[PDB]
Amino acid sequence: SSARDDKLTALLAQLDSLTRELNVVSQQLLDLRQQVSA
């Protein structure tokens, strides 16, 4: 079953980038929220 593990290890590598590019948005949204506070 070598042809089916590539579909899963490529999904783990792109959820890696998805939870990382969402992680910089969740840190830039609390920057410009507390920028409105001043």
Partner: protein, 50 residues
């Protein structure tokens, strides 16, 4: 224990072991060898108290 919150804390910077310099000029860098560096205010860890 309590750790830092990488989301809610505004001034958080993920400083890895290569750049954490507590006991800077009195402790060998990344090794049990002889000391190296200068005396300098630390950057790790973040204060949980005070």
């Amino acid at each position: 224990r309590q750790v830092v919150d990488d989301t809610k804390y505004k001034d958080y910077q993920q400083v890895g072991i290569l750049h954490q310099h507590n006991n800077s000029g009195f402790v060998g860098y990344l090794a049990p060898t002889m000391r190296e560096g200068q005396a300098y205010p630390a950057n790790f860890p973040y204060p949980l108290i005070g």
